[PDB]
Design a protein around this ligand. Structure first.
Ligand SMILES: C[C@H](Cc1ccccc1)C(=O)N1CCC(O)(Cn2cnc3ccccc3c2=O)CC1
Length: 332
């Protein structure tokens, strides 16, 4: 085609599904691992793993907009409002949890963790009485506040900011009875691929915010870590920008698939090249087409994560099993 990349078919109010699928698909290391997944004897209709192998294979080889129908059935979101009553990270968590589980006792075990799991500390400090309490807490994504925050940095600052527990919802320091305290969070690790959700949907039903929130092509996060490391500093490259319109809502995803800063818009079946300004700055908001989710890759990890993927990477049992189904489909 015009781009070398191909689109996905619209077959429902799947909303963010197509944006999310092309984002996962262009996370080449994830792709490679999905292809190695022992889906030999899987029921061809109820296996989320295989279904996703299908879509990836398809987006890699076909000239023709790919379809999602078997996948939507796969994981059982089939009602009118099933995608309207969840967010992206819930879908994402459904797809990755499936695939991480399938990948147990295999060559590719532990890929999803390695790609997207970071580590946070959650601490509670009482002011007067001396008592403190830390504990680790894994995350595969971050939800960042927007309202009243001008740019990413301000959202991070707000995330790791300390909060008080006075009067009404004091802290049970246990032996020490109710106590005034501060609780906060801090990062121990940031993963290779960093899924950040922007908090534009709030509740008399939920409404979409649309104010200006800015983010950069390059994101220094070292400041937000509990202890840094001058060998691998926490600098992220922007990889995808997932976007929505209105309240009436269109859903597109911008990508720079190779991390080289050459951008494409993915509007279902239409995939054109575009400027960095349409991808980035045009998605800030202001006074209502704008970004709800961002994917950043650590610069140290760019190459491994975006490693090149040929057709040799798909294995044989899969290729021929995928081949057959098209043929049975051809019988019509
Ligand atoms: C249906 C809705 C359309 C939409 C609403 C708000 C902003 C943009 C487009 C849609 O398709 N959504 C997909 C995107 C979200 O997932 C983002 N999101 C995630 N996590 C949160 C956690 C807490 C609070 C708020 C959010 C949030 O807005 C919202 C739902």
């Amino acid at each position: 085609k015009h781009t070398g990349y191909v689109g996905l078919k619209n077959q429902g109010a799947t909303c963010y599904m197509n944006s999310l699928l092309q984002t996962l698909f262009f996370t080449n290391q994830l792709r490679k691992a999905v292809y190695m997944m022992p889906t030999e004897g899987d029921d061809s209709s109820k296996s989320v793993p295989l279904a996703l192998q299908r879509v990836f294979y398809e987006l890699q080889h076909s000239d023709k907009p790919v379809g999602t129908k078997k996948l939507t059935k796969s994981f059982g979101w089939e009602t009118l409002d099933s995608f309207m009553q969840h967010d992206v990270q819930e879908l994402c968590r459904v797809l990755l949890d499936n695939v991480e589980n399938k990948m147990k006792g295999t060559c590719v075990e532990g890929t999803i963790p390695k790609l997207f799991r970071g580590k946070m500390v959650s601490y509670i400090q009482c002011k007067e009485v001396d008592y403190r309490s830390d504990r680790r807490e894994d995350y595969y994504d971050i939800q960042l506040s927007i309202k009243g925050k001008k740019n990413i940095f301000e959202s991070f600052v707000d995330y790791v900011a300390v909060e008080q527990l006075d009067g009404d919802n004091k802290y049970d320091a246990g032996e020490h009875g109710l106590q005034e305290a501060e609780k906060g969070v801090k990062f121990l690790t940031l993963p290779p691929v960093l899924h950040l959700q922007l908090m534009r949907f709030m509740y008399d039903q939920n409404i979409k915010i649309n104010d200006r929130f800015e983010f950069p092509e390059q994101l220094p996060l070292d400041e937000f870590l509990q202890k840094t490391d001058p060998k691998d500093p926490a600098n992220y490259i922007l990889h995808a920008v997932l976007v929505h319109s209105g309240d009436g809502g269109h859903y597109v995803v911008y990508l720079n698939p190779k991390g080289d800063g050459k951008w494409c818009k993915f509007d279902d079946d239409v995939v054109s090249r575009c400027t960095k300004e349409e991808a980035i700055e045009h998605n800030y908001g202001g006074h209502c087409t704008n970004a709800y989710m961002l994917v950043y890759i650590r610069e140290s990890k760019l190459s491994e994560v975006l490693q090149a993927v040929t057709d040799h990477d798909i294995p044989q049992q899969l290729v021929e099993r995928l081949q057959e189904e098209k043929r049975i489909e051809a019988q019509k």
